[PDB]
Design a protein around this ligand. Structure first.
Ligand SMILES: [Mg+2]
Ligand SMILES: [Mg+2]
Ligand SMILES: [Mg+2]
Ligand SMILES: [Mg+2]
Ligand SMILES: [Mg+2]
Ligand SMILES: [Mg+2]
Ligand SMILES: [Mg+2]
Ligand SMILES: [Mg+2]
Ligand SMILES: [Mg+2]
Ligand SMILES: [Mg+2]
Ligand SMILES: [Mg+2]
Ligand SMILES: [Mg+2]
Ligand SMILES: [Mg+2]
Ligand SMILES: [Mg+2]
Ligand SMILES: [Mg+2]
Ligand SMILES: [Mg+2]
Ligand SMILES: [Mg+2]
Ligand SMILES: [Mg+2]
Ligand SMILES: [Mg+2]
Ligand SMILES: [Mg+2]
Ligand SMILES: [Mg+2]
Lengths: 206, 262, 177, 143
RNA sequence: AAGCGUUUACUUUGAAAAAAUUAGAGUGUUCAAAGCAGGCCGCCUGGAUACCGCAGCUAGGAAUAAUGGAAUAGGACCGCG
RNA sequence: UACCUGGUUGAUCCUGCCAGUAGCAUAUGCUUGUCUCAAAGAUUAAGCCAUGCAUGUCUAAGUACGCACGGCCGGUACAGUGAAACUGCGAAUGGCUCAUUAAAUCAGUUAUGGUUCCUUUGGUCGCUCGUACUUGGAUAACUGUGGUAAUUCUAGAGCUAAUACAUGCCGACGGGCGCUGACCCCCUUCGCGGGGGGGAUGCGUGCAUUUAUCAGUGGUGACUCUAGAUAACCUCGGGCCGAUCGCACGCCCGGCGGCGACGACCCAUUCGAACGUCUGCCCUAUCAACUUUCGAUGGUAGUCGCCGUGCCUACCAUGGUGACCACGGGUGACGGGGAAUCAGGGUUCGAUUCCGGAGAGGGAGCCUGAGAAACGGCUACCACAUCCAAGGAAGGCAGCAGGCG
RNA sequence: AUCCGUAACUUCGGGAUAAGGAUUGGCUCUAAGGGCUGGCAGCCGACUUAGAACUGGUGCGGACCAGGGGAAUCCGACUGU
């Protein structure tokens, strides 16, 4: 098949290596996974040593970490915006490692409303009619209102992150190798990372 | 080759087994186990070629399948079981306990011990591993994974295990002045006190060991095994006592004893 | 050449066949081999058709429905014997197992019974007690060795604290000197 | 300065987006008595193939050569000289082997003809299996 | 006792160096080529050792051949603000 | 044993080659009484093969309703051998040959802190908090209808088991650990305030994988090492947490008991395998420049791989080797330990029983399996070749003997 | 038209578009090649070049435009008349 080998190509000086053996089973490559966004389709592949590798082919959710507070959530991936390797992987939505994806901000919003009891996103004018978030924000005890007030001192959020929570989509970088283990885990971008990737997205848009 | 090797040639056999050339093309390939290929000596060679109890390998198979041979506290029914250094082979009907100690040469020696000595043995640890819940582990030379050890036991130390329970009793720490069995190389079989330790970053460390008769020699630590504190061992010693006197002195001790015997 | 289910032709088709496929027996473990079969659509290009009567009609054919052929073997699994004889979970299977008579010339008439598989015996009950007794022994070994290492580590910590106090006292002696 | 590529160039070890009320730089000791430079700690560059601030370990051999080419980026070509002995003609001969060695950007004052110390590591590319550990400057050339 | 004291080439020791082969210890295969056996009224023993180019590691030496120091003094040293 | 002689001339002294002289192989001729060892289709054809054999295997301990034998103590299943067959393991070892191959293989030295690893051995295997006195239905061997000219070709109908394929719980297990925290209690203050406790309900709470954050039990010359704390994920083409088997047979007032064998997540050990670091290979210049967007030399980010790597992909830089012989070509070259001749130096050979590599007519691709790009495994094309009813089937002796050339 | 490749011979300029191959349509994108004002920001104007995907009955310089080629012999060098 498609072999991974050092003998099939030239030397350092420029001469050709002549074949002293044929292709082996350890000198083996396989076709690419190239997983998409959709309903989950993971195929197992037996590899060297009797082990398994999980080829993802369509994959929608991923366990994304918000590193400033150390709180990861399983979140649906809806769009791929930036990829440093190939812009064809941006055009055809393909998840590899170090992709920039857009994800739903609702689990991090629910965690922030449960922990710091402050509004997040929430364009001014709207109120919740099922009233459940209002119940979760209100109804505090006297001694635990002190604890939420001490949490409120360290509840400062960045402006670009706050605008992304207001829009509803967060930028996340893929950290796990998706065609190998089958998961599409990663981390939400913050700070200079977020400024760099938003500058690259703005330069691509124009 | 397309996989692992299963045969062993008689020419490709190691020299300390002292197998002869004319009888067979193949050598008994040892099975996998607690010891390496060229460090152990198989049960078929220990039973047939050294003790001369059995004539053929079929007779060796009959002896090991009557459940007579008891290697270090468990009956092994394989003729090619790797019996390496500090292994205790027990035979119940003859009442014979044997401890596989090297001779003064490179070969192993037929070394008779008491049952009180056969109840325990000594093993050098190789590394300390931290298990899945913060549990210290010793890795010995014969692959014995003993957990919850004494934290003073370090990388290059030896432990006096018990055969009936598989636990440690005492330990020798690798210090200067202690005894030294040399387990491998050109000085295989030497016994002497440790006089110097030379550390090396990257390259492997070396130890200068002084013999009881004053023959100092350097040896890398990978083939070094301490057997006790000071000049007092914790095991029994074969004749020769790990000296390696010169070939002229060996000729003298042969010829004078032969002329005295007559 | 035999036919094959699910090929959707009427001619002859050569196919790779492996373990778990029709019209092929694997000789080596995982052996694949080309075999030549026919399409499943029934046409005049056939020697044999196999027919299985599902519903019995009005008339009685003397070749098939008249000659009644019994089972060759009887149920061996105890759960299948319970399903056959409508048995409960506590009643006996040993009395209601089906045994076969054997008779021929020269030999005496015999009656041979099958070995009932998956029957709850005191040997299986002893093994079931045995592995949980081994679980008990492992947990007791863990508790005793953990307590022994706790006492040993407490002793090592006390001696290390004594050594640290001796070192700090030596530092105080050097500072006073 | 830095981060002139497509992806965000960063050190994978340290986390740099923590809650505030200078980036914490990761470095390590290399071993074998080699002193780490001051610029590898002070500066704001990164390099994943640096033996001080990267994911590579020095193992086995520690060799030396002389620098003859600095046209490649983040790596240099060195030249080793040795005298091979033929047993028939009891003489020597000059043979050279020019290996490609990854040059970490902590060593900035690097010219040609400098006696450089290299160390064996994992293969970072097709021909590079060596990192630069310390750079001795050539004889003279103090200006 | 541990660590650092221009770098080598050169010389010596030690380790690591598969066995089979070469030199060679012992041994009446009736001798020898061979083999690792064998010998005594159960015991006594041997199955060594030398060499293994070249390259790599290590510790002594600094005679010989390279290699630099300080010369717009961006030099060491003992101290200071 | 560091060795010479004849031949140019009418005769002499030199250079100079030829011829003798003596070994090791290869063949051949003549002759041959004894005995111990002993190479042996390598040189040309890694050319083609008739025939027969070379990898199969059962223990008290995975399945026994084939009377194929066989015991009488039976009715509380199976006494005991055992054809065949399912399941597991081996078949990736050994043997043959040197075709290809010139920093390649291979030899010495190294590391995997850059990776896998069946078996064996030593560790783990009630750590998880939510019908078990044992769950489901197919199937081979057995019976019965056959198709073809023909295969180690197989189908349909009946049946019947698993340590084959799946599902899945009782127990440990009564309580702890982090968070939610209704609410309650105590002191002080005019009072908001401030300090210290207890606490219903619910959520998660074992090892393995993945991702992110914090601190720094045991180590290394050196980790982004092992371990610890938090947050979650958890692949339906699902990571383990026994729905196994055999021998002696006891104790307690139905429940507890041994010696083992077998099945496996993970960590070591062993057998290894594979990539790498440095050094080393015959002749040729009538081979002086070679490689290079069809990877050539590096960087960044990925795919894939067991892992490190232009191995591959996208974008960049124009780099890399060479008169110290690169590149190209030839080899009547597998490399080495080694063999012969030998003063001291060398020269020639090494296909050949030991180690490593490559291959099964020539390439290419894949299933199974820990391990193969395996050929006494398949799948296609080319060369060679068998039977045929002309629709079709079957092959790989550079294995052991042997046949042709 | 674009990308390869191009021999004998020679006056070294040529032969040469030698010879011999591949691609060409539509649609939807990506990248690269710039000015004015106050390594950065804002505002604007141009045609090209390269690459990818999808798709049509393999059809695509779809009409038009638009070299058949190679090896030799004789004569005249040639451009020209
Ligand atoms: Mg083989
Ligand atoms: Mg010489
Ligand atoms: Mg040798
Ligand atoms: Mg003349
Ligand atoms: Mg004459
Ligand atoms: Mg001659
Ligand atoms: Mg006679
Ligand atoms: Mg005779
Ligand atoms: Mg031949
Ligand atoms: Mg040949
Ligand atoms: Mg050739
Ligand atoms: Mg050849
Ligand atoms: Mg050879
Ligand atoms: Mg092969
Ligand atoms: Mg052939
Ligand atoms: Mg093959
Ligand atoms: Mg064959
Ligand atoms: Mg074979
Ligand atoms: Mg022409
Ligand atoms: Mg003419
Ligand atoms: Mg004219």
């Amino acid at each position: 098949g498609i072999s991974r080998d050092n003998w099939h190509k030239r030397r350092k000086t420029g001469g050709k290596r002549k074949p002293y053996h044929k292709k082996r089973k350890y000198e083996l490559g396989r076709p690419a996974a190239n997983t998409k966004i959709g309903p989950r389709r993971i195929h197992t592949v037996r590899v060297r040593g009797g082990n398994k590798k999980y080829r993802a082919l369509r994959l929608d959710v991923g366990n994304f970490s918000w590193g400033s507070e150390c709180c990861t959530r399983k979140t649906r991936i809806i769009d791929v915006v930036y990829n440093a390797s190939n812009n064809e992987l941006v055009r055809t939505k393909t998840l590899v490692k170090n992709c920039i994806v857009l994800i739903d901000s609702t689990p991090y919003r629910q965690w922030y409303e449960s922990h710091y009891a402050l509004p997040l996103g929430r364009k001014k004018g709207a109120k919740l009619t099922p009233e459940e978030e209002e119940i979760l924000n209100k109804k505090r005890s006297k001694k635990i209102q002190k604890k939420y007030d001490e949490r409120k001192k360290n509840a400062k959020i960045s402006s670009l992150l706050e605008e992304q929570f207001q829009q509803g989509k967060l930028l996340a970088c893929i950290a796990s190798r998706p065609g190998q283990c089958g998961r599409a885990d990663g981390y939400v971008l913050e700070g200079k990372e977020l400024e760099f990737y938003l500058r690259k997205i703005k330069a691509r848009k124009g | 080759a397309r996989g692992p090797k299963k045969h062993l040639k008689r020419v490709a056999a190691p020299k300390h087994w002292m197998l002869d050339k004319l009888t067979g093309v193949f050598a008994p390939r040892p099975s996998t186990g607690p010891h390496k290929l060229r460090e152990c000596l198989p049960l078929i060679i220990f039973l047939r070629n050294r003790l001369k109890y059995a004539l053929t390998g079929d007779e060796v198979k009959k002896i090991c399948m009557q459940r007579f041979i008891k290697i270090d506290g468990k009956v092994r029914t394989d003729i090619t079981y790797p019996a390496g250094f500090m292994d205790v082979i027990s035979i119940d009907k003859t009442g014979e306990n044997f401890r596989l100690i090297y001779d003064t040469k490179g070969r192993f020696a037929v070394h008779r011990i008491t049952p009180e000595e056969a109840k325990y043995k000594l093993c050098k640890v190789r590394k300390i591993f931290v298990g899945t819940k913060g549990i210290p582990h010793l890795v010995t030379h014969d692959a014995r994974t003993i957990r919850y050890p004494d934290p003073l036991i370090k990388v290059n130390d030896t432990i006096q295990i018990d055969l009936e329970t598989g636990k440690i009793t005492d330990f020798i720490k690798f210090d200067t002045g202690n005894l030294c069995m040399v387990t491998g190389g050109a000085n295989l079989g030497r016994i002497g006190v440790i006089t110097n330790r030379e550390r090396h970053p990257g390259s492997f460390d070396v130890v200068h060991v002084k013999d009881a008769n004053g023959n100092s020699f350097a040896t890398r630590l990978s083939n070094i095994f301490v057997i006790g504190k000071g000049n007092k061992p914790w095991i029994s010693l074969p004749r020769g006592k790990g000296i390696r006197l010169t070939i002229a002195e060996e000729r003298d001790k042969r010829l004078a004893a032969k002329q005295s015997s007559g | 050449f035999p036919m094959k289910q699910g090929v959707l032709t009427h001619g002859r088709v050569r196919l790779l066949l492996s373990k778990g496929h029709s019209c092929y027996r694997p000789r080596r473990t995982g052996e694949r081999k080309r075999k030549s079969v026919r399409g499943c659509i029934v046409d005049a290009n056939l020697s044999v058709l196999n027919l299985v009567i599902v519903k019995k009609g009005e008339k009685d054919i003397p070749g098939l429905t008249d000659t009644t052929v019994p089972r060759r073997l009887g149920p061996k699994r105890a759960s299948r014997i319970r399903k056959l004889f409508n048995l409960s979970k506590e009643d006996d299977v040993r009395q209601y197992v089906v045994r076969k008579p054997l008779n021929k010339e020269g030999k005496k008439p015999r009656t041979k019974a099958p070995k009932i598989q998956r029957l709850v015996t005191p040997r299986v009950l002893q093994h079931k007690r045995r592995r949980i007794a081994l679980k008990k022994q492992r947990t007791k070994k863990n508790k005793e060795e953990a307590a022994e290492y706790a006492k040993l580590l407490a002793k090592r910590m006390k001696e290390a604290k004594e050594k640290r106090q001796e070192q700090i006292a030596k530092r105080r002696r050097l500072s006073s000197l | 300065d830095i981060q002139t590529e497509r992806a965000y160039q960063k050190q994978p070890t340290i986390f740099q987006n923590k809650k505030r009320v200078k980036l914490p730089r990761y470095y390590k000791n290399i071993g074998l008595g080699f002193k780490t430079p001051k610029e590898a700690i002070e500066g704001t560059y990164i390099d994943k193939k640096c033996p001080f601030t990267g994911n590579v370990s020095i193992r086995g051999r520690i060799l030396s050569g002389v620098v003859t080419k600095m046209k490649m980026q983040r790596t240099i070509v060195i030249r080793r000289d040795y005298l091979h002995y033929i047993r028939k003609y009891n003489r020597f001969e000059k043979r050279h082997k020019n290996m490609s060695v990854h040059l970490s950007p902590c060593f900035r004052d690097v010219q040609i003809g400098d006696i450089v110390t290299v160390g064996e590591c994992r293969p970072l590319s097709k021909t590079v299996r060596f990192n630069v550990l310390k750079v001795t400057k050539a004889a003279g050339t103090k200006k």
